[PDB]
Write a protein that binds this ligand. Structure first.
Ligand SMILES: [K+]
Ligand SMILES: [K+]
Ligand SMILES: [K+]
Ligand SMILES: [K+]
Ligand SMILES: [K+]
Ligand SMILES: [K+]
Ligand SMILES: [K+]
Ligand SMILES: [K+]
Ligand SMILES: [K+]
Ligand SMILES: [K+]
Ligand SMILES: [K+]
Ligand SMILES: [K+]
Ligand SMILES: [K+]
Ligand SMILES: [Mg+2]
Ligand SMILES: [Mg+2]
Ligand SMILES: [Mg+2]
Ligand SMILES: [Mg+2]
Ligand SMILES: [Mg+2]
Ligand SMILES: [Mg+2]
Ligand SMILES: [Mg+2]
Ligand SMILES: [Mg+2]
Ligand SMILES: [Mg+2]
Lengths: 148, 59, 56, 314, 38, 178
RNA sequence: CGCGCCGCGGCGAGCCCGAGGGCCCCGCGGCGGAGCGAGCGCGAGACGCCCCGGGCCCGCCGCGCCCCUGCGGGCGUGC
């Protein structure tokens, strides 16, 4: 709303906050980003390291759905099991009726190892594992599995 | 003494009598209490504030 | 035309207006620049003290 | 508690349970925020023409001819400036102004629910402007079931006690005060009751009445519930409308009504109660302040400091 | 209350202190400008 | 004239009232401000100041952080002037009593299903206005992503990342990269 | 219209009147949720009302030692 703005509080002041000595002119520094290596060098080095130059290999066309790679940690695995069933599985730490969790159905590929699991056997099927995700899973009685 | 000799040209000073001290307090005496300037008019206010140091009346 | 080259006339008054700041209390104890052979032995000693050790 | 239900003639005929949408907290801040954004979404754009002021040919004469430097038409007439007669605006209005505003779906449902809860108070409906001094219940439910002649529909509104609110609206029609009467907004009337209906034909017999509006219960409008952005409208529910309120809120998928809270009536009660009062402990006695005055003036003033009298009075 | 009793008693105790200290201090002030003289 | 400049500093501005238009916040703050003036307890004084804060100074608290902090003192009332969310990475919750400004719908369901209680600040006001057997708690005020870019990336003692995308090398490969 | 910061509202490990279809109803992306590395790729729990610092863990660069499926795995050390 125009009626609550700072600029309407300057009616009657000859110069709307821009000063008498300097004033308000068109483009006293130039337009846009120009000057970054000469007269704005003090600005560009203080706040934008690595703005100038080249770095690394280039790919003329990236395949966005090849490089896509979702991930899930082991501390998030038991929340994929619906709440109505988690209690019973913990109740009976079965080796012969352990829960099977296939994480690609939920849309993940690799399993990483942050966190910890409850003391309960469980089977996890995925496309790739990290080394300590496997280590913490075998510590619990679980098995990792690879799936198509 | 050595600080006061630095600001001599701003100040004048000397030794007061017990008559000078009495008139200043009885006539121009106000007290600082919680940062406020409070008229000193009776012994009730010197006792409440300074009784820990065994000053109880104006004298 | 020529303009003034240099003065420090008002600069001690600007330096004093917000007080003269002091460095952070934790800069006096920064490990930066101490001998590495002393900083290695410092970590080793604490890790094997049950009153100080923070291993799980 | 149960709401009462009246026949199309005025006696008590039935009882229905309170729908849960009336227990939502009253939020005049949320109703004002939503009413503001959704009343901006009905606007029609306006703008000046893009050629206006720039169809003529004009150029500066320059210095040396004893005249100001603005562009001039052949002959010397001022042109092409905001300070010249016939020139363009300094910054012309454009239709790319953002005319609409966005509101989340959760906050749109809160505003309807808070505006409906305000309608269940006889003290907020009165303070909104309506005349409800001769009304059986302010959650007013009435059994009509089919109304086609305006004459019969006028008879019900009398048979209950909302007759004075529609005459309040009828006798108020007038020509408005400004330029608005050249722009198809020539008359103004005050706003009366809102009839909300579900399965019965009532619209034909109610619509012609001054200051009356019609809402099918499945789609309730916030600009109707809070005219002027003031919440408490008087609402005449048909029986089938009032008895489908909970079904309607069950039809909103993965939605729960907001949590009920306490009022300043409830807070003022707690503080005046023995569980809170028993923690109270009094302040010290406060300093006593007089004005200065010369003790030496009199015997009594001086005696206040020194009682003995060693000190001379004067 | 008990506040009005203590404030009643206290001032009384302070007042009799004011008549004790006045006379002694008047005695002291006369005695200084004597001892120097001797 | 009077010289009131030397040895004297400029006065300070702090929030002495909430600036929310929510009527439930004004009612509670005005109520706890009253209890402080008739009690002098410093629990009701810190709690009165928490209710004036600006929602970036009131971060959330998760159940797993509370379960961790309240361990070994599980018979006490946690008091939080913010929202309590849920942490699904914790499989089992303990029984506790929490009083908060707001609970998530899923956090309320879990707290109650363990035997716990979800109090409101007006339940707290009625039963325990001066904070007996209560602990005051808060979340990590410096957890926001915005507060991770404050400063001068590019200066040799910064440890802060820049803001946009920077595709070059100059000044970005360590010292002696300019 | 784009960028930064601050305030307030709603919901919260989630969030969301795209376009479209039947002021009401239904409605994908996306952004957030993990980072680091030029890249092959590998991938975080240990403490803490809050803030500041310390310690430790992940990636990139280096290097003892032991081993199975081996220029691959494990366990360490240092800026
Ligand atoms: K300015
Ligand atoms: K200037
Ligand atoms: K220029
Ligand atoms: K320019
Ligand atoms: K540049
Ligand atoms: K290159
Ligand atoms: K033209
Ligand atoms: K001119
Ligand atoms: K001119
Ligand atoms: K929403
Ligand atoms: K709405
Ligand atoms: K930057
Ligand atoms: K590398
Ligand atoms: Mg001025
Ligand atoms: Mg002028
Ligand atoms: Mg300038
Ligand atoms: Mg100049
Ligand atoms: Mg000028
Ligand atoms: Mg300074
Ligand atoms: Mg001209
Ligand atoms: Mg014109
Ligand atoms: Mg006029």
């Amino acid at each position: 709303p125009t009626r609550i703005r700072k600029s309407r509080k300057r009616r009657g002041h000859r110069q709307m906050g821009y000063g008498r000595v300097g004033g308000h002119r068109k483009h006293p520094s130039g337009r846009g980003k120009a000057g970054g290596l000469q007269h704005k060098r003090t600005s560009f080095d203080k706040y934008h390291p690595g703005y100038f130059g080249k770095l690394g290999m280039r790919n003329y066309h990236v395949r966005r759905n090849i490089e896509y790679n979702p991930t899930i940690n082991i501390d998030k695995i038991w929340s994929l099991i619906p709440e109505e069933q988690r209690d019973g599985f913990l109740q009976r730490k079965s080796t012969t009726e352990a829960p099977v969790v296939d994480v690609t159905r939920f849309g993940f590929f690799k399993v990483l190892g942050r966190g910890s699991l409850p003391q309960c056997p469980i089977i996890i099927k995925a496309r790739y594992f990290s080394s300590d995700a496997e280590k913490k899973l075998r510590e619990v009685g679980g098995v990792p599995l690879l799936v198509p | 003494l050595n600080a006061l000799r630095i600001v001599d040209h701003y100040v004048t000073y000397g030794e007061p009598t017990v008559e000078t001290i009495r008139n200043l307090i009885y006539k121009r005496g106000f007290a600082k209490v919680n940062g406020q300037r409070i008229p000193i008019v009776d012994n009730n206010l010197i006792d409440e504030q300074l009784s820990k140091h065994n000053i109880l009346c104006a004298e | 035309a020529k303009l003034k080259n240099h003065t420090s006339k008002n600069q001690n008054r600007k330096d004093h207006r917000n007080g003269i700041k002091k460095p952070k209390k934790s800069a006096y104890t920064s490990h930066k620049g101490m001998c590495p052979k002393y900083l290695r032995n410092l970590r080793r000693s604490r890790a094997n003290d049950p009153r100080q050790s923070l291993r799980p | 508690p149960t709401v009462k239900v009246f026949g199309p003639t005025g006696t008590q005929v039935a009882e229905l349970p309170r729908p849960k949408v009336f227990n939502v907290p009253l939020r005049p801040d949320i109703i004002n925020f939503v009413h503001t954004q959704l009343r901006k979404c009905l606007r029609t754009p306006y703008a000046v023409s893009r050629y206006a002021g720039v169809q003529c040919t004009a150029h500066s004469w320059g210095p040396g001819r004893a005249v100001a430097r603005l562009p001039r038409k052949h002959g010397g007439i001022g042109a092409y400036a905001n300070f010249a007669r016939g020139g363009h605006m300094a910054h012309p209005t454009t239709v790319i102004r953002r005319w609409c505003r966005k509101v989340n779906l959760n906050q749109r449902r809160y505003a309807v629910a808070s505006a409906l809860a305000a309608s269940a108070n006889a003290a907020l409906v009165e303070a909104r402007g309506h005349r409800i001094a001769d009304v059986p219940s302010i959650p007013l439910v009435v059994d009509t079931d089919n109304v086609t002649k305006t004459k019969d529909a006028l008879a019900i509104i009398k048979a209950v006690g909302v007759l004075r609110d529609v005459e309040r609206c009828k006798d108020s029609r007038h020509i408005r005060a400004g330029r608005g009467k050249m722009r198809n907004r020539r008359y103004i009337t005050r706003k009366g009751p809102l009839v909300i209906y579900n399965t019965e034909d009532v619209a034909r017999g109610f619509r012609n009445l001054p200051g009356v509006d019609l809402c099918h219960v499945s789609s309730i409008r916030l600009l109707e519930l809070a005219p002027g952005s003031h919440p408490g409208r008087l609402i005449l529910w048909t029986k089938s409308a009032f008895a489908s309120l909970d079904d309607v809120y069950a039809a909103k998928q993965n939605y729960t009504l907001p949590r009920s809270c306490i009022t300043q009536t409830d807070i003022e009660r707690i503080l005046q109660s023995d569980a809170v009062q028993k923690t109270f402990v009094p302040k010290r006695d406060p300093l006593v302040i007089e004005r200065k005055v010369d003790p030496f003036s009199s015997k009594e003033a001086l005696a206040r400091l020194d009682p003995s009298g060693t000190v001379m009075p004067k | 209350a008990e506040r009005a009793t203590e404030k009643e008693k206290r001032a009384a105790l302070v007042k009799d202190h004011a008549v004790k200290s006045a006379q002694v201090y008047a005695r002291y002030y006369i005695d200084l400008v004597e001892s120097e003289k001797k | 004239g009077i010289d009131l400049k030397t040895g004297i500093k400029k006065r300070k501005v702090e929030r002495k009232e909430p600036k929310s238009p929510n009527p439930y916040i004004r009612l509670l703050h005005n109520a706890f401000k009253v209890v402080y003036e008739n009690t002098g307890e410093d629990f009701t004084k810190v709690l009165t100041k928490r209710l004036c804060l600006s929602k970036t100074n009131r971060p959330v608290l998760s159940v797993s952080r509370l379960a961790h902090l309240m361990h070994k003192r599980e018979d006490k009332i946690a008091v939080v002037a913010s929202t309590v969310t849920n942490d699904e990475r914790l499989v089992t919750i303990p029984r506790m009593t929490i009083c908060a400004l707001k609970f998530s719908a899923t956090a309320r369901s879990r707290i109650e299903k363990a035997g716990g209680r979800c109090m409101s600040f007006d339940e707290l006001l009625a039963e325990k206005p001066t904070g007996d057997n209560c602990v005051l708690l808060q979340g990590r005020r410096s957890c926001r992503a915005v507060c991770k870019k404050f400063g001068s990336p590019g200066r040799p003692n910064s440890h802060v990342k820049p803001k946009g995308e920077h595709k070059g090398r100059r000044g970005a490969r360590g010292r002696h990269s300019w």
